[PDB]
């Protein structure tokens, strides 16, 4: 009798697991009899309780194997290969669809009866977030389209505002929605090339709080970020491929992803501002501050930064046809649930409440 390396490879695929120890550990759990498994009876972790019965017989014989890490390494290679194929063949449209489908799957758990989350608290987050900018959901939808099209030159958005104007909050939320990375170009010009290597194969990137010079008039400390950027023109426009470092390893060539730039109100050289479409800017607004102060479970649960919160806002506001055709079925049922759960006047209470700067969950 023999271990089926195939069945392990299935488990790795179905779970999208790609750490050889994470895989090895979880498969070994299945050696004990599913018949009595506490995690199963407690319906505790889906990547366990969905699977324990299926894999039981193979996991038992795997537990005797003299070869365990070799099997897991071949299984891990299979999952990395799948990512590699997808990265080079898929449309950007499909990638976002995949990313969206995964978030909806995790929301099925969070707000399922087994789940711990409260949909009303998360919806309170959407109201506060929606209030942050006029026509927030149109801003979000425009931004998403822009990333999916990745049209050259028309690729980069600028976020301006004072400290605590929320730009870092929203950037993080978008980055959690789409997937991507942040970068810090305030560095001197030697470190920069290794720094930029981070972007390789990412869907999206973000430039955090760049520093100009002479803004210390406005008490904004000087730095070189702008002067670095104003010499990175060819990366921003995305019109032609560039070579990206990574430490020790060889250079690789691709188009530098689209992205977002964030700053306090330093002066922007006219050369650089031409690189941006659609400069958004942010004020402070005392009532949002007072509201957070009276509904701190938002922050304490990290709701306001979540990609899940943005997805909920899109479902609440956008027409179904705006979603990619595959997920439209899941979109319909989530609209259905949300319509069933919040009658609109509930949401009007929440919005009106935030406008009064009182605690959104009155």
Partner DNA sequence: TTTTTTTT
Q: Are 246 and 204 in contact (CB under 8 A)?
A: no
Residue 243 DSSP code:
E
> Binds 187, which of DNA, its own copies, ligand ATP, none (CB < 5 to 8 A, cut-off by type)?
its own copies
Q: Kindly report the CA angle at 244 between 229 and 16, in degrees rounded to 5?
A: 115
Token digits of residue 273: 């501002």
How far is it, in rounded angstroms, from Cα 140 to Cα 235? 24
In a 3-state reduction of DSSP, which class is residue 230?
coil
Least separation, in Å, of the C-beta of 179 and its own copies?
A: 10
> Binds 82, which of DNA, its own copies, ligand ATP, none (CB < 5 to 8 A, cut-off by type)?
its own copies
Region binding DNA by CB under 7 A among candidate stretches 113-121, 130-138, 189-197, 274-282: 189-197
237 among the known binding-site residues?
A: no
Q: Is the CB of 103 or the CB of 304 nearer to ligand ATP?
A: 304
Q: Indicate which single residue of 249, 270, 300, 340 sits in contact with DNA (rule: CB under 7 A).
A: 249
17 among the known binding-site residues?
A: no
Least separation, in Å, of the C-beta of 247 and DNA?
A: 4
Q: Is the CB of 210 or the CB of 331 nearer to ligand ATP?
A: 210
By CB under 7 A, is residue 188 in contact with DNA?
A: yes
326 among the known binding-site residues?
A: no
The closest of 345, 304, 342 to 132, measured between CA atoms, is: 304
> Binds 284, which of DNA, its own copies, ligand ATP, none (CB < 5 to 8 A, cut-off by type)?
ligand ATP
By CB under 7 A, is residue 245 in contact with DNA?
A: yes
How far is it, in rounded angstroms, from Cα 305 to Cα 167? 11
Q: Are 342 and 123 in contact (CB under 8 A)?
A: yes
Residue 52: what are its φ and ψ, rounded to 5°?
-55, -45
Q: Kindly report the CA angle at 33 between 32 and 35, in degrees rounded to 5?
A: 150
Residue 336 vs residues 116, 117, 197, 269: alpha-carbon distances, Å: 21, 18, 43, 49
162 among the known binding-site residues?
A: yes
48 among the known binding-site residues?
A: yes
The closest of 150, 125, 200, 139 to 174, measured between CA atoms, is: 139
Q: Which residues bind ligand ATP (CB under 6 A)?
A: 132, 153, 161, 163-169, 208-209, 237, 239, 262, 264, 274, 282-286, 288-289, 292, 299
Least separation, in Å, of the C-beta of 85 and its own copies?
A: 4
Q: Is the CB of 118 or the CB of 176 nearer to its own copies?
A: 176
Q: Are strands 252-254 and 242-244 parallel, antiparallel or unpaired?
A: antiparallel
Helix axes 307-317, 328-341, angle to 10 degrees: 80
Least separation, in Å, of the C-beta of 196 and DNA?
A: 12
> Binds 195, which of its own copies, ligand ATP, DNA, none (CB < 5 to 8 A, cut-off by type)?
its own copies
Least separation, in Å, of the C-beta of 240 and ligand ATP?
A: 8
By CB under 7 A, is residue 299 in contact with DNA?
A: no
166 among the known binding-site residues?
A: yes
Least separation, in Å, of the C-beta of 67 and DNA?
A: 17
How far is it, in rounded angstroms, from Cα 137 to Cα 126? 10
Q: Indicate which single residue of 13, 61, 109, 189 sits in contact with DNA (rule: CB under 7 A).
A: 189
Q: Are 110 and 337 in contact (CB under 8 A)?
A: no
How far is it, in rounded angstroms, from Cα 118 to Cα 141? 25
Least separation, in Å, of the C-beta of 292 and ligand ATP?
A: 5
The closest of 265, 268, 159, 150 to 207, measured between CA atoms, is: 159
161 among the known binding-site residues?
A: yes
Token digits of residue 307: 């990609």
Least separation, in Å, of the C-beta of 198 and DNA?
A: 13
Residue tagged 């909050």 (tokens): 169
Q: Is the CB of 35 or the CB of 190 nearer to DNA?
A: 190
* Interacting residue ranges for DNA, rule: CB under 7 A: 188-190, 194, 245, 247-249
- Residues of the binding site: 37, 40, 48, 52, 161-168
List, as residue ranges, the binding site for ATP: 161-168
């Amino acid at each position: 009798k023999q271990v089926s390396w195939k069945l392990v490879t299935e488990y790795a695929m179905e779970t999208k697991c790609d750490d050889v120890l994470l895989l090895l550990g979880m498969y070994l759990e299945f050696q004990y009899s599913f018949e009595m498994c506490l995690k199963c009876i407690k319906k505790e972790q889906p990547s366990h309780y969905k699977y324990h019965e299926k894999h039981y017989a193979n996991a038992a014989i795997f537990a005797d194997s003299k070869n365990q890490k070799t099997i897991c390494q071949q299984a891990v290679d299979t999952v990395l290969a799948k990512k590699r194929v997808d990265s080079l063949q898929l449309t950007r449209e499909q990638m976002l669809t995949n990313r969206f489908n995964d978030l909806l799957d995790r929301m099925d758990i969070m707000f399922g009866s087994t789940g711990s989350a409260d949909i009303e608290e998360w919806m309170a987050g959407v109201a506060w977030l929606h209030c942050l900018l006029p026509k927030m959901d149109s801003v979000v939808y425009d931004f998403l389209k822009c990333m999916v099209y990745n049209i050259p030159k028309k690729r980069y958005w600028l976020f301006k505002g004072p400290i605590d104007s929320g730009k870092t909050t929203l950037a993080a939320a978008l980055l959690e929605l789409c997937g991507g990375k942040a970068l810090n170009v305030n560095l001197p010009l030697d470190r920069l090339n290794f720094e930029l290597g981070v972007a390789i194969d990412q869907f999206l990137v973000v430039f955090e709080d760049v520093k100009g010079t002479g803004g210390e008039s406005r008490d904004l400390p000087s730095g070189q970020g702008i002067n670095n950027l104003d010499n990175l023109r060819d990366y921003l426009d995305g019109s032609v491929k560039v070579n990206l470092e990574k430490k020790h390893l060889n250079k690789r060539t691709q188009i530098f992803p689209p992205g977002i730039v964030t700053m306090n109100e330093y002066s922007v050289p006219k050369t650089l501002q031409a690189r941006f479409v659609k400069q958004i800017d942010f004020r402070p607004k005392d009532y949002l501050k007072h509201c957070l102060e009276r509904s701190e479970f938002l922050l304490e649960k990290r709701i306001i930064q979540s990609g899940i919160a943005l997805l909920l806002m899109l479902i609440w506001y956008r027409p179904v046809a705006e979603f990619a055709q595959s997920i439209q079925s899941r979109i319909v049922e989530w609209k259905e649930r949300l319509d069933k759960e919040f009658s609109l006047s509930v949401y009007q209470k929440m919005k009106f409440n935030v406008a009064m700067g009182i605690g959104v969950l009155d």
